[PDB]
Amino acid sequence: AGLYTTYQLLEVQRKLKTLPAFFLQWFPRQINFQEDMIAFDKVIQDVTRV
Amino acid sequence: TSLPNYLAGNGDLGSWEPTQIFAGEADIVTEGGAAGADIEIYQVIAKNAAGAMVPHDPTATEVPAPQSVAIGIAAQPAKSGQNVPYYIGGVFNHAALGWHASLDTLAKRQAVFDRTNIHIGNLY
């Protein structure tokens, strides 16, 4: 006291808030590609005919 | 035509559907002749009075004109004065061919090629 109030520091209270991954469980496949665009070819095959 | 695109975006690049011309197993036979009019691929053709290929034109006349009796199926397109390769024999899927108007149903499209080496029929 007098010059300055003495202190005890008790431990720091770190709240690290995060956004845990949920939707990325349905995007498991990863592609790293340098080409300009990605492309899909989707095919329908009606093999149900008699 | 100079710059790339840095911004994200989608693009429908295109679609492809096969065209099946043959519907059976006759002897496929071809010939070539001069065209008299603008002929598209797999258009059904006749020969006019001058012997030039002309797209098939039923009810051309009062006696029927020679354009009215079909003689083959264009194998590649051609403008007037050019030579047209065309089929004279084979079994052909009526759907793929180019037809005159009012020649709508398969029952009519067969009647054009009964007395002939070509025969025209449905796919399954």
Short mmCIF file of N, CA, C and O in Angstrom, two decimals, chain B residues 4-98:
data_model
loop_
_atom_site.label_atom_id
_atom_site.label_comp_id
_atom_site.label_asym_id
_atom_site.label_seq_id
_atom_site.Cartn_x
_atom_site.Cartn_y
_atom_site.Cartn_z
N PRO B 4 -7.76 -13.93 -67.70
CA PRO B 4 -8.39 -15.06 -67.02
C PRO B 4 -9.58 -14.59 -66.20
O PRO B 4 -9.87 -13.40 -66.18
N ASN B 5 -10.27 -15.51 -65.53
CA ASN B 5 -11.27 -15.15 -64.53
C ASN B 5 -10.74 -15.58 -63.18
O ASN B 5 -10.46 -16.76 -62.97
N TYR B 6 -10.62 -14.63 -62.26
CA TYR B 6 -10.20 -14.93 -60.91
C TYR B 6 -11.38 -15.22 -60.00
O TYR B 6 -11.24 -15.95 -59.01
N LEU B 7 -12.54 -14.68 -60.34
CA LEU B 7 -13.72 -14.82 -59.51
C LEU B 7 -14.31 -16.22 -59.65
O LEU B 7 -14.24 -16.83 -60.71
N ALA B 8 -14.89 -16.72 -58.56
CA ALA B 8 -15.54 -18.02 -58.60
C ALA B 8 -16.78 -17.97 -59.50
O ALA B 8 -17.33 -16.92 -59.79
N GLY B 9 -17.21 -19.15 -59.93
CA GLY B 9 -18.39 -19.26 -60.76
C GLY B 9 -18.65 -20.67 -61.24
O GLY B 9 -17.75 -21.52 -61.21
N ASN B 10 -19.87 -20.93 -61.67
CA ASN B 10 -20.24 -22.22 -62.24
C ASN B 10 -20.32 -22.12 -63.75
O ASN B 10 -20.39 -21.04 -64.33
N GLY B 11 -20.29 -23.28 -64.40
CA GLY B 11 -20.51 -23.33 -65.83
C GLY B 11 -21.03 -24.67 -66.30
O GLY B 11 -20.45 -25.71 -65.98
N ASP B 12 -22.14 -24.66 -67.04
CA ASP B 12 -22.66 -25.88 -67.66
C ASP B 12 -21.94 -26.07 -68.98
O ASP B 12 -22.26 -25.41 -69.98
N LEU B 13 -20.95 -26.96 -69.00
CA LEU B 13 -20.06 -27.04 -70.14
C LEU B 13 -20.78 -27.57 -71.37
O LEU B 13 -20.51 -27.11 -72.49
N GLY B 14 -21.68 -28.52 -71.21
CA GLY B 14 -22.48 -28.98 -72.32
C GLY B 14 -22.98 -30.39 -72.09
O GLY B 14 -22.72 -31.00 -71.06
N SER B 15 -23.71 -30.89 -73.08
CA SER B 15 -24.33 -32.21 -73.03
C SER B 15 -24.14 -32.89 -74.37
O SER B 15 -24.02 -32.24 -75.41
N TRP B 16 -24.13 -34.22 -74.36
CA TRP B 16 -23.97 -35.00 -75.58
C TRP B 16 -24.99 -36.12 -75.60
O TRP B 16 -25.14 -36.85 -74.62
N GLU B 17 -25.68 -36.28 -76.73
CA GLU B 17 -26.62 -37.37 -76.93
C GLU B 17 -26.25 -38.10 -78.21
O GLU B 17 -26.05 -37.46 -79.25
N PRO B 18 -26.12 -39.43 -78.19
CA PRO B 18 -25.79 -40.13 -79.42
C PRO B 18 -26.92 -40.03 -80.42
O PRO B 18 -28.09 -39.96 -80.04
N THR B 19 -26.57 -39.99 -81.69
CA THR B 19 -27.53 -40.16 -82.77
C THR B 19 -27.29 -41.53 -83.39
O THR B 19 -26.21 -41.80 -83.91
N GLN B 20 -28.29 -42.39 -83.31
CA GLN B 20 -28.22 -43.73 -83.88
C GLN B 20 -28.95 -43.72 -85.21
O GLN B 20 -30.15 -43.47 -85.26
N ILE B 21 -28.22 -43.99 -86.28
CA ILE B 21 -28.82 -43.97 -87.61
C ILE B 21 -29.30 -45.35 -88.02
O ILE B 21 -30.42 -45.50 -88.52
N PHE B 22 -28.50 -46.38 -87.79
CA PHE B 22 -28.88 -47.72 -88.22
C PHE B 22 -29.80 -48.38 -87.21
O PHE B 22 -29.57 -48.33 -86.00
N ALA B 23 -30.86 -48.99 -87.73
CA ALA B 23 -31.85 -49.70 -86.93
C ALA B 23 -31.93 -51.18 -87.29
O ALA B 23 -32.88 -51.85 -86.89
N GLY B 24 -30.97 -51.70 -88.06
CA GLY B 24 -31.01 -53.08 -88.48
C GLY B 24 -29.78 -53.49 -89.27
O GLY B 24 -28.77 -52.79 -89.23
N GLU B 25 -29.86 -54.61 -90.00
CA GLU B 25 -28.66 -55.24 -90.54
C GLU B 25 -28.88 -55.63 -92.00
O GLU B 25 -28.65 -56.76 -92.42
N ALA B 26 -29.37 -54.72 -92.82
CA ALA B 26 -29.27 -54.95 -94.24
C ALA B 26 -27.86 -54.59 -94.72
O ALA B 26 -27.03 -54.10 -93.95
N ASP B 27 -27.58 -54.87 -95.98
CA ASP B 27 -26.33 -54.44 -96.58
C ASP B 27 -26.36 -52.93 -96.74
O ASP B 27 -27.18 -52.40 -97.50
N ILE B 28 -25.49 -52.22 -96.02
CA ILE B 28 -25.41 -50.77 -96.13
C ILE B 28 -24.67 -50.43 -97.41
O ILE B 28 -23.54 -50.88 -97.63
N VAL B 29 -25.29 -49.62 -98.26
CA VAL B 29 -24.74 -49.33 -99.58
C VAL B 29 -24.89 -47.84 -99.85
O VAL B 29 -25.92 -47.25 -99.50
N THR B 30 -23.89 -47.25 -100.48
CA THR B 30 -23.81 -45.81 -100.64
C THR B 30 -23.48 -45.44 -102.08
O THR B 30 -22.98 -46.25 -102.85
N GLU B 31 -23.78 -44.20 -102.42
CA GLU B 31 -23.48 -43.66 -103.73
C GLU B 31 -23.31 -42.16 -103.59
O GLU B 31 -23.61 -41.58 -102.55
N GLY B 32 -22.80 -41.53 -104.63
CA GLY B 32 -22.58 -40.09 -104.63
C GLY B 32 -23.14 -39.45 -105.87
O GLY B 32 -23.09 -40.03 -106.95
N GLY B 33 -23.68 -38.25 -105.71
CA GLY B 33 -24.28 -37.55 -106.83
C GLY B 33 -24.35 -36.07 -106.56
O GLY B 33 -24.23 -35.62 -105.42
N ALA B 34 -24.54 -35.31 -107.63
CA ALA B 34 -24.62 -33.87 -107.49
C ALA B 34 -25.90 -33.46 -106.79
O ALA B 34 -26.96 -34.05 -106.98
N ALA B 35 -25.80 -32.44 -105.94
CA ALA B 35 -26.94 -31.89 -105.24
C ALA B 35 -27.58 -30.76 -106.03
O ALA B 35 -26.90 -30.05 -106.77
N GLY B 36 -28.89 -30.61 -105.87
CA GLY B 36 -29.61 -29.51 -106.48
C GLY B 36 -30.13 -28.50 -105.48
O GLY B 36 -30.67 -27.46 -105.87
N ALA B 37 -29.98 -28.80 -104.19
CA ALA B 37 -30.51 -27.94 -103.14
C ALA B 37 -29.72 -28.21 -101.87
O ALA B 37 -28.95 -29.16 -101.79
N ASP B 38 -29.92 -27.34 -100.88
CA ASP B 38 -29.20 -27.45 -99.62
C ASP B 38 -29.70 -28.68 -98.86
O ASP B 38 -30.86 -28.74 -98.46
N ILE B 39 -28.82 -29.66 -98.65
CA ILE B 39 -29.18 -30.94 -98.06
C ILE B 39 -28.48 -31.09 -96.72
O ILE B 39 -27.27 -30.88 -96.61
N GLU B 40 -29.25 -31.46 -95.70
CA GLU B 40 -28.72 -31.66 -94.36
C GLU B 40 -28.34 -33.11 -94.15
O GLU B 40 -28.73 -34.00 -94.91
N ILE B 41 -27.57 -33.35 -93.10
CA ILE B 41 -27.15 -34.70 -92.76
C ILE B 41 -28.37 -35.58 -92.54
O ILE B 41 -29.37 -35.17 -91.96
N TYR B 42 -28.28 -36.82 -93.03
CA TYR B 42 -29.34 -37.81 -92.92
C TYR B 42 -30.70 -37.27 -93.33
O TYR B 42 -31.73 -37.72 -92.83
N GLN B 43 -30.73 -36.29 -94.22
CA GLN B 43 -31.97 -35.91 -94.86
C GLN B 43 -32.33 -36.93 -95.93
O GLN B 43 -31.46 -37.43 -96.64
N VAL B 44 -33.62 -37.24 -96.04
CA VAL B 44 -34.08 -38.14 -97.09
C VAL B 44 -34.13 -37.39 -98.41
O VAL B 44 -34.65 -36.28 -98.49
N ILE B 45 -33.61 -38.01 -99.47
CA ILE B 45 -33.35 -37.32 -100.72
C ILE B 45 -34.12 -37.99 -101.84
O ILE B 45 -34.41 -39.19 -101.79
N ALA B 46 -34.45 -37.21 -102.85
CA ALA B 46 -34.94 -37.71 -104.13
C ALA B 46 -34.05 -37.15 -105.23
O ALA B 46 -33.15 -36.35 -104.98
N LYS B 47 -34.30 -37.59 -106.46
CA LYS B 47 -33.62 -37.03 -107.62
C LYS B 47 -34.62 -36.29 -108.48
O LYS B 47 -35.66 -36.84 -108.84
N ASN B 48 -34.31 -35.04 -108.80
CA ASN B 48 -35.18 -34.21 -109.60
C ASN B 48 -35.08 -34.60 -111.07
O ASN B 48 -34.32 -35.50 -111.46
N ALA B 49 -35.85 -33.92 -111.91
CA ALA B 49 -35.90 -34.24 -113.33
C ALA B 49 -34.55 -34.11 -114.00
O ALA B 49 -34.31 -34.77 -115.02
N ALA B 50 -33.66 -33.28 -113.47
CA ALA B 50 -32.32 -33.11 -114.03
C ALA B 50 -31.31 -34.09 -113.46
O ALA B 50 -30.12 -33.97 -113.77
N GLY B 51 -31.74 -35.03 -112.63
CA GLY B 51 -30.84 -36.01 -112.06
C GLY B 51 -30.04 -35.54 -110.87
O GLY B 51 -29.20 -36.30 -110.37
N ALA B 52 -30.27 -34.32 -110.40
CA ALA B 52 -29.59 -33.82 -109.22
C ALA B 52 -30.35 -34.18 -107.95
O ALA B 52 -31.58 -34.19 -107.92
N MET B 53 -29.60 -34.47 -106.89
CA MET B 53 -30.21 -34.77 -105.60
C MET B 53 -30.95 -33.55 -105.07
O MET B 53 -30.45 -32.43 -105.13
N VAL B 54 -32.16 -33.77 -104.57
CA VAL B 54 -33.00 -32.72 -103.99
C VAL B 54 -33.67 -33.34 -102.77
O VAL B 54 -34.05 -34.51 -102.83
N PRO B 55 -33.82 -32.63 -101.66
CA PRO B 55 -34.48 -33.24 -100.50
C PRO B 55 -35.87 -33.74 -100.84
O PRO B 55 -36.61 -33.10 -101.59
N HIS B 56 -36.22 -34.90 -100.29
CA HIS B 56 -37.45 -35.59 -100.67
C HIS B 56 -38.65 -34.68 -100.45
O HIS B 56 -38.77 -34.02 -99.42
N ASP B 57 -39.55 -34.65 -101.43
CA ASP B 57 -40.67 -33.70 -101.44
C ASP B 57 -41.92 -34.40 -101.97
O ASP B 57 -42.31 -34.22 -103.13
N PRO B 58 -42.58 -35.20 -101.13
CA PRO B 58 -43.81 -35.85 -101.58
C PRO B 58 -44.90 -34.84 -101.89
O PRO B 58 -44.94 -33.74 -101.33
N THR B 59 -45.78 -35.23 -102.81
CA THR B 59 -46.85 -34.39 -103.35
C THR B 59 -46.34 -33.29 -104.26
O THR B 59 -47.12 -32.42 -104.66
N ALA B 60 -45.06 -33.29 -104.60
CA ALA B 60 -44.60 -32.46 -105.71
C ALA B 60 -45.22 -32.95 -107.01
O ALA B 60 -45.26 -34.15 -107.28
N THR B 61 -45.69 -32.01 -107.82
CA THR B 61 -46.35 -32.36 -109.08
C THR B 61 -45.96 -31.40 -110.19
O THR B 61 -45.93 -30.18 -109.99
N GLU B 62 -50.71 -32.33 -113.37
CA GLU B 62 -50.91 -32.86 -112.03
C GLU B 62 -50.09 -34.12 -111.77
O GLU B 62 -50.12 -34.67 -110.66
N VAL B 63 -49.37 -34.60 -112.78
CA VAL B 63 -48.64 -35.87 -112.61
C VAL B 63 -47.55 -35.69 -111.57
O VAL B 63 -46.91 -34.62 -111.52
N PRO B 64 -47.29 -36.67 -110.71
CA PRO B 64 -46.25 -36.51 -109.68
C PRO B 64 -44.89 -36.20 -110.29
O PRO B 64 -44.51 -36.77 -111.31
N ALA B 65 -44.16 -35.29 -109.64
CA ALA B 65 -42.82 -34.95 -110.08
C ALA B 65 -41.81 -35.93 -109.49
O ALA B 65 -42.05 -36.54 -108.45
N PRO B 66 -40.65 -36.09 -110.15
CA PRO B 66 -39.69 -37.09 -109.68
C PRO B 66 -39.09 -36.78 -108.32
O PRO B 66 -38.51 -37.68 -107.71
N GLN B 67 -39.19 -35.55 -107.83
CA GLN B 67 -38.75 -35.28 -106.47
C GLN B 67 -39.55 -36.08 -105.46
O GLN B 67 -39.09 -36.26 -104.33
N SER B 68 -40.73 -36.55 -105.85
CA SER B 68 -41.67 -37.16 -104.93
C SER B 68 -41.33 -38.60 -104.55
O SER B 68 -41.94 -39.13 -103.62
N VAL B 69 -40.38 -39.24 -105.23
CA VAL B 69 -40.03 -40.62 -104.94
C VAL B 69 -38.63 -40.62 -104.33
O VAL B 69 -37.65 -40.28 -104.99
N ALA B 70 -38.56 -40.97 -103.05
CA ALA B 70 -37.30 -40.90 -102.34
C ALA B 70 -36.32 -41.92 -102.90
O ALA B 70 -36.71 -42.99 -103.35
N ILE B 71 -35.04 -41.57 -102.86
CA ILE B 71 -34.01 -42.43 -103.43
C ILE B 71 -32.85 -42.70 -102.49
O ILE B 71 -32.06 -43.61 -102.75
N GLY B 72 -32.69 -41.98 -101.39
CA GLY B 72 -31.61 -42.31 -100.49
C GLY B 72 -31.61 -41.40 -99.28
O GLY B 72 -32.50 -40.57 -99.09
N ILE B 73 -30.57 -41.56 -98.47
CA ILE B 73 -30.41 -40.83 -97.22
C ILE B 73 -29.05 -40.15 -97.26
O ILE B 73 -28.03 -40.83 -97.40
N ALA B 74 -29.03 -38.83 -97.12
CA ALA B 74 -27.78 -38.08 -97.19
C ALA B 74 -26.84 -38.56 -96.11
O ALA B 74 -27.23 -38.68 -94.94
N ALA B 75 -25.59 -38.84 -96.48
CA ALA B 75 -24.61 -39.24 -95.48
C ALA B 75 -23.85 -38.05 -94.92
O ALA B 75 -23.40 -38.10 -93.77
N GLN B 76 -23.66 -36.99 -95.70
CA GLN B 76 -23.06 -35.76 -95.22
C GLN B 76 -23.79 -34.60 -95.87
O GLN B 76 -24.37 -34.76 -96.94
N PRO B 77 -23.80 -33.43 -95.24
CA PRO B 77 -24.55 -32.30 -95.79
C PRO B 77 -23.86 -31.68 -96.99
O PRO B 77 -22.65 -31.84 -97.18
N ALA B 78 -24.63 -30.97 -97.80
CA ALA B 78 -24.05 -30.35 -98.98
C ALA B 78 -24.92 -29.19 -99.44
O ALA B 78 -26.14 -29.21 -99.29
N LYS B 79 -24.28 -28.19 -100.02
CA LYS B 79 -24.97 -27.10 -100.70
C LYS B 79 -25.15 -27.43 -102.18
O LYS B 79 -24.52 -28.34 -102.72
N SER B 80 -26.02 -26.67 -102.83
CA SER B 80 -26.33 -26.93 -104.23
C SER B 80 -25.06 -26.88 -105.06
O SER B 80 -24.17 -26.06 -104.82
N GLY B 81 -24.97 -27.78 -106.04
CA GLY B 81 -23.80 -27.89 -106.88
C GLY B 81 -22.70 -28.78 -106.33
O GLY B 81 -21.84 -29.20 -107.10
N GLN B 82 -22.70 -29.06 -105.04
CA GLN B 82 -21.72 -29.97 -104.47
C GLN B 82 -22.19 -31.41 -104.58
O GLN B 82 -23.37 -31.68 -104.81
N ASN B 83 -21.26 -32.34 -104.44
CA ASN B 83 -21.60 -33.75 -104.44
C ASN B 83 -22.06 -34.18 -103.06
O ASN B 83 -21.50 -33.76 -102.05
N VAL B 84 -23.09 -35.01 -103.01
CA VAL B 84 -23.65 -35.54 -101.77
C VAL B 84 -23.37 -37.03 -101.72
O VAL B 84 -23.82 -37.75 -102.62
N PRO B 85 -22.68 -37.54 -100.72
CA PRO B 85 -22.70 -38.98 -100.49
C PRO B 85 -24.01 -39.35 -99.82
O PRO B 85 -24.48 -38.63 -98.94
N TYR B 86 -24.61 -40.45 -100.25
CA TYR B 86 -25.88 -40.82 -99.65
C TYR B 86 -26.02 -42.33 -99.62
O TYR B 86 -25.44 -43.04 -100.45
N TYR B 87 -26.79 -42.82 -98.66
CA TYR B 87 -27.10 -44.23 -98.59
C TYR B 87 -28.17 -44.60 -99.59
O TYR B 87 -29.14 -43.87 -99.78
N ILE B 88 -27.98 -45.74 -100.24
CA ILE B 88 -29.01 -46.35 -101.05
C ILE B 88 -29.48 -47.67 -100.48
O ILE B 88 -30.54 -48.17 -100.89
N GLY B 89 -28.75 -48.27 -99.55
CA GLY B 89 -29.19 -49.49 -98.91
C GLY B 89 -28.88 -49.46 -97.43
O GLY B 89 -27.96 -48.78 -96.99
N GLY B 90 -29.65 -50.22 -96.67
CA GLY B 90 -29.47 -50.30 -95.24
C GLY B 90 -30.79 -50.21 -94.51
O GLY B 90 -31.81 -49.87 -95.13
N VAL B 91 -30.81 -50.51 -93.22
CA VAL B 91 -32.01 -50.38 -92.40
C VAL B 91 -31.79 -49.21 -91.46
O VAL B 91 -30.83 -49.20 -90.68
N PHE B 92 -32.68 -48.22 -91.51
CA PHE B 92 -32.41 -46.94 -90.87
C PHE B 92 -33.46 -46.58 -89.84
O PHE B 92 -34.66 -46.79 -90.05
N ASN B 93 -33.00 -46.03 -88.71
CA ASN B 93 -33.87 -45.51 -87.66
C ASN B 93 -34.61 -44.29 -88.17
O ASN B 93 -34.01 -43.24 -88.38
N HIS B 94 -35.93 -44.41 -88.34
CA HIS B 94 -36.69 -43.31 -88.92
C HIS B 94 -36.54 -42.03 -88.12
O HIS B 94 -36.67 -40.93 -88.68
N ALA B 95 -36.30 -42.14 -86.82
CA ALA B 95 -36.29 -40.94 -85.98
C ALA B 95 -35.11 -40.03 -86.30
O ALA B 95 -35.26 -38.81 -86.26
N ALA B 96 -33.96 -40.60 -86.62
CA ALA B 96 -32.76 -39.80 -86.86
C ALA B 96 -32.81 -39.03 -88.17
O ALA B 96 -32.08 -38.05 -88.33
N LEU B 97 -33.65 -39.45 -89.11
CA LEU B 97 -33.64 -38.88 -90.45
C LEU B 97 -34.43 -37.58 -90.52
O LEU B 97 -35.34 -37.34 -89.73
N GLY B 98 -34.06 -36.74 -91.48
CA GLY B 98 -34.81 -35.53 -91.76
C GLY B 98 -35.92 -35.84 -92.75
O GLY B 98 -35.68 -36.46 -93.78
#
